[PDB]
Amino acid sequence: PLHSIISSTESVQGSTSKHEFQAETKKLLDIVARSLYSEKEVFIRELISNASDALEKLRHKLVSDGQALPEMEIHLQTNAEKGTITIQDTGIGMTQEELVSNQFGVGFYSAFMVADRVEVYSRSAAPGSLGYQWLSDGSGVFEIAEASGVRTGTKIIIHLKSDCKEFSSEARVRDVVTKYSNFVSFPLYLNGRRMNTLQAIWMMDPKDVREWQHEEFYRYVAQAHDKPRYTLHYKTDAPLNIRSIFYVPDMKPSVALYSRKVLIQTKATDILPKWLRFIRGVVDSEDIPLLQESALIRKLRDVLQQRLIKFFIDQSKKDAEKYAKFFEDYGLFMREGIVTATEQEVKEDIAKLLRYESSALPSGQLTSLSEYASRMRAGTRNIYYLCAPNRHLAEHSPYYEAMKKKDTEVLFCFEQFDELTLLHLREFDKKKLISVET
Ligand SMILES: Nc1nc(Cl)c2cnn(Cc3cc4c(cc3Br)OCO4)c2n1
């Protein structure tokens, strides 16, 4: 089962031509190498991500041209003996000009975060392409030379710093891979061992994913053994770029942040409003660059809050008995969110999820503030509710019994935390929330 492709096949016949980065390239290299990423280990993530993109570009090209498909793989090799770590892909490679002038991303230069020297071999996939070697110690000077024995694609050999030797031990590198790159779109091997088995199902067409995949992934992200009660597969480009799946556990009572199938933060606590912290799943967006995550993250937070509210509302429409169970189990969060919200309009959005018993309905079945209001006739600026220990006492309440042959229907709350929520909300839509007993 041991499968490796990394070996010394490369040789350079002539001497190298020395180049020197410009004022820009000098700033870039310095900032990315020590000022940009907080943890140094993410260089593995960036290079893996680069290798994936190059693999994709070649595959799309061959498939577009109708050509057959070669081995499309990503390989990592650690050498603690030589203090090196190497990553090779068999993707679309690089031309001489690209090796010289170079938006695949900076991500490649993140290597100088842990290396005092980087040695590169690349060969373009286009027929008759030549291979080239690229050398650099990161001092703004790099060398270029035509190389033979270069396989199509790109091979990066990192000569690790004295105190970065940890990334030459397989055990350390394996952990880094499984942490950040477990959903990589192409086969990934480490010292010949296959490492990635999980599929990024959030990138799929939602109507192609089936139940068992959503169950598997839910159990992964939520580290859970039950099943998702609710599943929302949300994809969008207009507001921002968004690839995401949200789950509500079957069980009674966080979301991962990804970008292009690579992990940014396992606990994206700021991605959703605090009251939606019961939601499990993943958010993938190309729009994200630590303790301070908030920036335009908020814009995404607001997008997701609105999409989730509409989701649960739509759920209410199609299924009321299931949603009534959901409201029973998770109402707490909605109430917390309503009392927490600063803007009134946000309060009323979340409040659209609340369900209460009504006087004009059989005891047991619930209604929403909107549903109550629609039937309201010749009624201005009022929503009437009564809080009692139970439906029995609510109906037999003289306060309500007054509304018996009178104008309006009356909502029934049986818990004090529901009444306080209405009091706090004050007005909803065109109407003010008012207690029968004053
Ligand atoms: N794996 C892979 N495949 C391809 Cl097609 C490309 C294209 N750019 N890069 C990153 C990169 C690598 C370099 C470099 C500048 C950059 Br930007 O100078 C030395 O090597 C790639 N990496």
UniProtKB/Swiss-Prot annotation:
CC per GO annotation: membrane; mitochondrial inner membrane; mitochondrial intermembrane space; mitochondrial matrix; mitochondrion; nucleoplasm
One MF term from GO for this chain?
Answer: protein kinase binding
In which tissues does this protein get expressed?
Found in skeletal muscle, liver, heart, brain, kidney, pancreas, lung, placenta and bladder. Expression is highly reduced in bladder cancer and renal cell carcinoma specimens compared to healthy tissues, but it is increased in other type of tumors.
Which UniProt keyword terms apply here?
Acetylation, ATP-binding, Chaperone, Membrane, Mitochondrion, Mitochondrion inner membrane, Nucleotide-binding, Phosphoprotein, Transit peptide
* Amino-acid positions noted as binding ATP in the UniProt annotation, renumbered to this chain: 50, 89, 102, 108
Which superkingdom, per the lineage? Eukaryota
- GO terms of biological process kind: chaperone-mediated protein folding; negative regulation of cellular respiration; negative regulation of intrinsic apoptotic signaling pathway in response to hydrogen peroxide; negative regulation of reactive oxygen species biosynthetic process; protein folding; translational attenuation
Q: Give its localization.
A: Mitochondrion; Mitochondrion inner membrane; Mitochondrion matrix
Q: Which residues form a coiled coil?
A: none
User: Residues bearing Phosphoserine?
Assistant: 101
On this chain, the residues bearing N6-acetyllysine are 165, 227, 235, 310, 317, 352
Leader sequence residues:
none
Keyword Kinase in the entry? The reply is no
Q: Which residues carry this modification: Phosphothreonine?
A: 380
Q: What is its main location?
A: mitochondrion
**Summary of the function given for this chain in its UniProt record:** Chaperone that expresses an ATPase activity. Involved in maintaining mitochondrial function and polarization, downstream of PINK1 and mitochondrial complex I. Is a negative regulator of mitochondrial respiration able to modulate the balance between oxidative phosphorylation and aerobic glycolysis. The impact of TRAP1 on mitochondrial respiration is probably mediated by modulation of mitochondrial SRC and inhibition of SDHA.
Q: Member of which family?
A: Belongs to the heat shock protein 90 family.
- What assembly does the database describe for this protein? Binds to the intracellular domain of tumor necrosis factor type 1 receptor. Binds to RB1. Interacts with SRC. Interacts with SDHA.
Under which name does UniProt file this protein? Answer: Heat shock protein 75 kDa, mitochondrial
Whichever gene encodes this chain, its name is TRAP1
State start and end of the fragment within the whole protein: 70 to 552 of 704
